[PDB]
Every structure is written in structure tokens, then in C-alpha cells.
């Protein structure tokens with residue numbers, strides 16, 4: 377039996393010369409055993425869900441602040457940094473954004489002049505959402521995910537930009553307006569990030585590189601790249617990870633790891649073990665070696681890496697379980713973190729605290 381998390385060395389303190397150590401949280405986790413683990417080990421937090429656009433402005437002019445406020449309060453009380461996830465995304469985003477003045481979807485519009493008016497209305501709505509949110513949280517947030525997942529996994533257009541509703545209505549303009557709006561209301565010292573998954577592999581990596589180069593050339597304020605790092609044991613390679621961070625550091629950008637989890641599976645995650653108990657020791661060992669190499673790379677790169685956030689605290693709460701159940705008939709368990717479902721350490725803990 378492994379010791380409890382509160383009996384081992386703080387991860388945040390272990391990494392205090394290199395980068396923050398963060399966790400994605402929900403408001404209900406900010407007391408009890410999670411509360412304790414958080415305070416002991418972490419010096420940054422992010423909202424898993426409560427600061428996404430639909431969580432903050434579910435109807436126009438109607439702001440729901442309480443979950444988000446509770447997260448901010450917890451960070452302040454415990455002297456934690458706070459990442460804002462996220463100003464702009466194509467999911468968990470309210471439908472009302474994308475409806476024209478008569479209530480019909482803007483994407484359906486064929487008259488070029490009405491389309492231009494729709495583009496301007498959506499951009500103005502985006503600006504209002506950003507202005508309102510940034511005004512409330514500008515003195516708490518230490519890193520903004522200003523846009524999330526705006527780059528495509530393939531190449532549907534020459535710039536590799538995701539053809540979401542934002543793109544269909546505004547082209548790339550939503551991205552420019554989101555950064556400029558955030559800079560304007562948060563101030564010059566605010567740290568603005570473009571966040572995405574699979575930043576280590578091509579062609580996405582290069583499309584993202586080209587996008588940030590382009591926007592920097594136009595004076596669009598971007599401070600860094602957020603690497604979600606939803607990764608596996610063998611993929612991507614350490615070198616793929618390294619190369620991606622070095623490329624962005626080459627443009628004068630900061631890197632953060634924002635949503636780290638190390639799945640026990642491939643993609644899709646099948647076959648998956650049905651219970652935590654069913655997972656063999658070998659999975660935890662191979663994960664531990666993987667985590668060792670990750671954190672050695674993060675330390676080597678620490679001039680260009682300011683924060684490493686995990687997408688959860690302990691293995692009792694992870695969205696990888698939703699994915700395992702989805703691809704295995706509603707039955708499956710992943711185990712991505714250094715802390716097990718009882719808040720005891722896992723073999724990976726030892727390999728990143730040393």
C-alpha cells in the first residue's frame with residue numbers, strides 16, 4: 377500500500393524553480409479530500425467546465441458567475457495562480473451567439489450584405505462576452521486561454537484553420553478580435569494563450585506555427601501556446617514534444633502544458649480495463665517511466681515553460697473515463713494521474729518527485 381498524497385513532498389515546491397503545477401477542478405471538489413490534495417501539491421488551478429462560454433453567459437446579457445467565482449475564491453484563499461479556460465471555443469458555447477436578428481442560424485445566410493452584418497454582430501457579441509469576463513477576473517487570472525482549438529486536425533483550407541461556426545461566419549477575424557479584446561481589457565501584463573491538442577504532430581503543429589507567425593506579424597497580442605497534452609504512454613514521442621515547444625519558443629512565445637493526462641490506452645481507447653482494480657501493475661509502471669521522461673523534458677525546457685497543469689487531480693475524476701466507456705460499451709476505466717482514486721500516490725508520483 378502506497379502513502380496518502382498529503383504525506384509526500386509537494387509537487388509545486390519540487391518544481392518551484394521551473395514551473396507551476398496545476399489542476400483542473402470543478403466547484404464541488406474544493407473541500408474534503410480533493411481540497412486537501414490541492415492545497416498540499418498545487419499552486420495553480422483552472423476550471424474544467426465552469427468558465428467556458430456557456431457556463432458564463434447562457435443567454436445574452438445573463439451572466440452566471442457562481443461556479444467560476446467559487447474557483448477564483450479558492451485560488452485566492454490558497455495563494456494559487458489561475459488559468460482562464462476559455463474565452464472562445466466551438467463546444468460548450470451557447471447557440472444564441474450564432475443566431476441572426478430574426479432568430480435563424482447565421483451559417484444559413486446567403487445574401488452577402490446580411491452575411492457581413494452577421495459577421496459584425498457576432499464579433500461585437502464576442503467582444504462583449506470577453507470584455508465582461510475579463511473585467512471581472514483580470515486581477516485573478518495569471519494565464520488566459522483566449523482561444524481554444526481553432527486549428528484543424530487536417531487541411532480543409534490552406535491555413536489549416538478549423539471550419540467551426542466561428543470560422544464559417546468570421547473567417548479568422550474572431551481569433552484576432554479575441555486576442556485584441558483580451559489585451560485591451562486585461563492590460564499589458566495579462567498572459568494570452570492560444571490553446572490546443574495535438575500540438576506535437578503534423579500537419580496541425582505547422583498550421584498552428586503558421587497561424588501564430590501570421591498573427592504576431594500583424595501585432596496581434598499572443599504571449600504563448602497552450603499544449604493540452606492529452607497524450608499516451610508511447611505517443612507522441614519525447615522529441616515530438618520537444619520540437620513543438622522549441623519551435624514556439626523560437627517565435628518568442630511562452631509554452632504551458634494545460635490539460636496533461638497520460639492515458640493507459642491508445643486511440644480510440646480500446647480495449648479498456650472495466651474497473652480500476654482490473655488494471656495491471658505493468659500499466660502503472662510503464663506510465664511511471666513515461667511520466668519520468670516527460671518531467672525531465674519539462675525541466676530541461678523550463679526557460680520556455682512556465683506552467684504544467686494536469687486535467688484533474690486524482691484518478692477518481694477524469695474525462696478519459698467518459699471516453700473509455702464510449703468506446704467499450706459504457707464500461708471502462710482509465711488512470712491518467714500520479715494520484716489514485718483514494719488519493720494515495722501511484723508509481724508515477726515517485727518518478728516525478730525525485
Ligand SMILES: [Mg+2]
Nearest residue numbers: 668727728730
Ligand atoms: Mg524523475
Ligand code: NA
Nearest residue numbers: 394678681682
Ligand atoms: Na519556467
